[PDB]
Amino acid sequence: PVEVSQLTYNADTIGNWVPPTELKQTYTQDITGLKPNSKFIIVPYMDRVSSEVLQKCTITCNEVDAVGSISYFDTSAIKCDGYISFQANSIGEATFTLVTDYQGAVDPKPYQYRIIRAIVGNN
Ligand SMILES: [Zn+2]
Ligand SMILES: [Zn+2]
Ligand SMILES: [Zn+2]
Numbered sequence: 001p002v003e004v005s006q007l008t009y010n011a012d013t014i015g016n017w018v019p020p021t022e023l024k025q026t027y028t029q030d031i032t033g034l035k036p037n038s039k040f041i042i043v044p045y046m047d048r049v050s051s052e053v054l055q056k057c058t059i060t061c062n063e064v065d066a067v068g069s070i071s072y073f074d075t076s077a078i079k080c081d082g083y084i085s086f087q088a089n090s091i092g093e094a095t096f097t098l099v100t101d102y103q104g105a106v107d108p109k110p111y112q113y114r115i116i117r118a119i120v121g122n123n
Helices: none
Strands: 008-016 024-031 039-045 055-061 067-073 079-087 094-102 112-119
Touching: 039 067, 055 079, 079 094
Parallel strands: none
Antiparallel strands: 008 112, 024 094, 039 079, 039 112, 055 067, 055 094, 067 079
């Protein structure tokens, strides 16, 4: 276990949200490989060419006690906003619900996320 005076963060876990296959979709994704039972923040980031076709995605977390929402939008009124606080489950995962509303969806590029972990104690 890491002493509190030695607190650091790891903000290098990045990943992609699976793109929808239809213009309107509600679906889930399990993020895996996280330290079991650790507490995290996930935030959106963007490094992504705009579709110009109004690709909206909203994300929440299904884990008990998770709070927050993440918003993406790529066209004019850009959104890369919100965050979720959550705890990985006992198997190192967390499930998210994605609600997508895309005006057009030909080979849609994934929206992107960053996980922030405080490395302290056993977290
Ligand atoms: Zn799994
Ligand atoms: Zn509670
Ligand atoms: Zn294709």
